[PDB]
């Protein structure tokens, strides 16, 4: 956390990739499977605003939900449960949080990796599966998220 410069977390991101322990959560139509196109910082980082696209019934839904900063980089905000967002890696071109999900039944563990570009380099995608194992979110589970993002851009 003392070597993240919260600087870079602000920007356009696309999502190109999640994890998660619970896999139903993230696959095409999940709740948990939202199409990032903006993240802001409110109050030098205190709070996050995310724009990002959930789909409904095959129909592209543009929404913004405010996260609330708990301790360092981790974030509180509701949306379809509740959910700590970590940032647990952010660099110029690519960013990678982990969520844990709480909806009444069963906690999942998540991650999501962001990209300026459209793809992560093979190292980027080795830090990102790192990181995965790191907190116990499966390899196994991981969706390319942009190779279905047919919402607008």
């Given at each position: 956390?003392?070597?993240?410069?919260?600087?870079?977390?602000?920007g356009e991101w696309r999502i190109i990739y999640a994890a998660a322990d619970n896999k139903d959560k993230i696959v095409e139509g999940g709740p948990l499977r939202?199409?990032?196109r903006r993240i802001e910082c409110i109050n030098d980082c205190e709070s996050l605003s995310i724009t990002f696209y959930l789909k409904d019934q095959g129909t592209c839904l543009l929404l913004t939900e405010v996260a609330k900063r708990q301790e360092g980089y981790v974030y509180?905000?509701?949306?379809y449960g509740t959910n700590t967002l970590e940032v647990i890696h952010v660099s110029e071109n690519m960013l990678v949080t982990y969520v844990e999900n709480y909806d009444g039944e069963r906690i999942t563990k998540m991650t999501e990796g962001l990209a300026k570009g459209t793809s992560f380099t093979p190292e980027e995608l080795e830090k990102y599966q790192q990181l995965n194992?790191?907190?116990?979110v499966p390899n196994e589970n991981i969706e390319n998220l942009?190779?279905?993002?047919?919402c607008p851009p």
């Open positions: 956390p003392a070597e993240i410069d919260p600087s870079k977390i602000p939202n199409y990032y509180v905000l509701e949306f194992s790191e907190r116990g942009i190779k279905t993002d047919n």
